[PDB]
Amino acid sequence: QDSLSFGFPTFPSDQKNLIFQGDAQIKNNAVQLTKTDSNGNPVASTVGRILFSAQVHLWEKSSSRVANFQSQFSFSLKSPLSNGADGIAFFIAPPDTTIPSGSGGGLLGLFAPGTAQNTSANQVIAVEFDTFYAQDSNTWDPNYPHIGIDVNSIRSVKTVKWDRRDGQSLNVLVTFNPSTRNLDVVATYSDGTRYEVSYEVDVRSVLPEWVRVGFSAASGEQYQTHTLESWSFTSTLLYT
Amino acid sequence: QDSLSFGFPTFPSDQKNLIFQGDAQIKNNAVQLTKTDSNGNPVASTVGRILFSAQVHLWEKSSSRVANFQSQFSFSLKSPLSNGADGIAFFIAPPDTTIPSGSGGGLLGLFAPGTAQNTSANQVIAVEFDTFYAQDSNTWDPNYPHIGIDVNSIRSVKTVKWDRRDGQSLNVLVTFNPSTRNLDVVATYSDGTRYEVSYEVDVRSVLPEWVRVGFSAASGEQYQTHTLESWSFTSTLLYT
Numbered sequence: 083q084d085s086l087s088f089g090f091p092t093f094p095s096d097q098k099n100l101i102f103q104g105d106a107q108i109k110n111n112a113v114q115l116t117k118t119d120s121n122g123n124p125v126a127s128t129v130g131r132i133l134f135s136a137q138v139h140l141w142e143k144s145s146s147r148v149a150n151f152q153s154q155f156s157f158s159l160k161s162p163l164s165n166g167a168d169g170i171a172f173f174i175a176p177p178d179t180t181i182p183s184g185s186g187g188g189l190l191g192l193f194a195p196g197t198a199q200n201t202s203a204n205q206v207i208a209v210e211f212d213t214f215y216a217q218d219s220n221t222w223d224p225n226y227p228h229i230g231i232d233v234n235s236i237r238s239v240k241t242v243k244w245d246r247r248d249g250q251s252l253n254v255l256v257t258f259n260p261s262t263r264n265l266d267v268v269a270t271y272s273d274g275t276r277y278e279v280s281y282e283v284d285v286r287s288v289l290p291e292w293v294r295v296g297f298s299a300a301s302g303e304q305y306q307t308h309t310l311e312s313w314s315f316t317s318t319l320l321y322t
Numbered sequence: 323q324d325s326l327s328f329g330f331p332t333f334p335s336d337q338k339n340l341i342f343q344g345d346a347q348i349k350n351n352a353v354q355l356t357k358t359d360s361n362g363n364p365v366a367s368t369v370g371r372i373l374f375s376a377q378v379h380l381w382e383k384s385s386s387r388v389a390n391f392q393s394q395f396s397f398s399l400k401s402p403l404s405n406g407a408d409g410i411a412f413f414i415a416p417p418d419t420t421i422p423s424g425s426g427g428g429l430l431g432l433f434a435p436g437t438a439q440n441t442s443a444n445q446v447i448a449v450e451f452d453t454f455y456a457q458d459s460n461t462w463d464p465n466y467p468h469i470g471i472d473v474n475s476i477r478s479v480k481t482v483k484w485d486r487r488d489g490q491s492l493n494v495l496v497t498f499n500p501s502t503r504n505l506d507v508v509a510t511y512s513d514g515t516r517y518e519v520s521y522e523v524d525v526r527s528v529l530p531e532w533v534r535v536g537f538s539a540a541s542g543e544q545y546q547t548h549t550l551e552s553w554s555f556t557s558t559l560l561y562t
């Protein structure tokens with residue numbers, strides 16, 4: 083289909099169109115990407131991702147069209163620790179994507195250690211909300227919590243300072259305009275605090291024509307819950 | 323998802339989200355539900371169907387919600403003969419639905435011979451565009467071409483006389499309003515010739531909460547091409 087759209091105002095336990103990977107699972111009308119104990123408390127060493135089952139037609143070679151898409155979502159992070167890790171990410175990847183071996187912790191369940199920073203060995207675009215930046219383990223991160231745009235590498239092509247607020251929902255709008263090739267990210271807290279970051283990227287030289295969209299999260303030695311509360315997505319092919 | 327929407331202005335050959343069953347296949351940016359020979363002509367004894375891969379949440383018991391949906395599509399029938407058979411149908415059925423044994427010809431690939439008229443044995447709602455009605459084989463049909471609403475039986479609960487026009491596209495709009503429970507069908511040829519048939523049906527009593535939507539067509543001894551040219555669909559769960 084040239085256009086596809088779907089919305090999850092909440093996440094009831096009875097799902098049919100979501101592909102669960104790793105420890106991801108639904109609890110209390112929300113997606114808990116990372117594992118939690120019986121008390122609903124976050125645990126270490128966990129990775130989880132979800133993907134919408136239907137494939138998205140991102141671009142079409144034969145007709146010179148590229149999709150205009152928008153992803154609006156809401157999530158909250160919670161941890162009794164002062165340094166909850168590692169973060170959650172909205173990503174776009176080939177349809178057959180699976181959790182890479184050893185992609186836990188700072189790799190956010192998106193990259194394999196061996197090629198995490200090799201832009202030539204990956205095919206993924208992701209917007210990360212990264213809360214762990216210890217300069218000794220996450221050597222690629224700026225020294226502070228941040229929102230980053232990742233293009234085939236865990237080392238963001240760009241970041242902006244971000245404030246982690248325990249138990250508060252962050253509303254995010256990610257959009258791509260094929261005309262300007264601008265990928266824009268706008269995130270806000272309920273008090274109006276706003277964050278914005280934009281990047282120009284030709285998705286055609288990074289991803290195949292058909293892809294799957296979803297979320298990924300992980301916790302290494304430090305942990306926190308990564309709760310996806312809502313998500314709506316829309317995509318339509320346009321001439322360029 | 324509470325809401326799902328997709329649109330196929332045309333049908334390029336590289337499909338990812340369509341389930342092809344029987345003889346259905348893509349040709350010339352359109353879906354040929356029934357088999358055709360090399361030079362593109364219709365052949366006898368052929369059944370074919372397609373379903374969108376993502377499951378549609380038709381109703382949710384926990385919230386007492388039912389989806390309002392709208393399916394828009396156009397198709398054309400072509401046949402060297404003037405007695406083209408057997409027809410095309412838009413249908414909604416459980417997710418695991420498959421072509422029943424011996425459902426060719428007048429059964430349109432939707433019902434099994436032994437239970438075609440047993441309502442309590444089927445789970446399907448379909449809008450049929452029936453062009454063959456010989457009373458010896460299709461004993462359940464009115465004596466003329468027609469559009470019918472089928473609820474668990476090949477014997478339509480409601481029909482309207484219809485005119486088959488070889489090689490001309492029929493634009494169809496099917497809508498279900500959960501508030502009134504009316505399933506409305508509006509079909510028109512480009513010259514404005516309009517056909518309307520409606521029926522009140524409580525979908526919760528006929529189909530499971532999650533379903534799949536698609537098209538089915540077949541030809542027995544008599545034949546014609548069943549070309550699905552475009553298809554748009556949208557459903558949203560609502561409180562009544």
Ligand SMILES: OC[C@H]1O[C@H](O[C@@H]2[C@H](O)[C@@H](OC[C@H]3O[C@@H](O)[C@@H](O)[C@@H](O)[C@@H]3O)O[C@H](CO[C@H]3O[C@H](CO)[C@@H](O)[C@H](O)[C@@H]3O[C@H]3O[C@H](CO)[C@@H](O)[C@H](O)[C@@H]3O)[C@H]2O)[C@@H](O)[C@@H](O)[C@@H]1O
Pocket residue numbers: 127128165167168184185186187188189214216217218219220301302303304305
């Ligand atoms: O150095 C100060 C920082 O300490 C804390 O962070 C540590 C640190 O960055 C580094 O320390 C390595 C070792 O240090 C020793 O002193 C002991 O503390 C050892 O236990 C410790 O292993 O790395 C630590 C481990 O990093 C993992 O966890 C982080 C946070 O979740 C991830 O971002 C990393 O990617 C990494 O995860 C990987 O390894 C895990 C197993 O070790 C595995 O489970 C994952 O799947 C993944 O492969 C780190 O905790 C902390 O207090 C900082 O705030 C402080 O600045």
Ligand SMILES: [Ca+2]
Pocket residue numbers: 168169188212213214215220223
């Ligand atoms: Ca990090």
Ligand SMILES: [Ca+2]
Pocket residue numbers: 408428452453454455460463
């Ligand atoms: Ca018939």
Ligand SMILES: [Mn+2]
Pocket residue numbers: 210212222223224228230236238
């Ligand atoms: Mn980062």
Ligand SMILES: [Mn+2]
Pocket residue numbers: 450452462463464468470476478
């Ligand atoms: Mn009939």
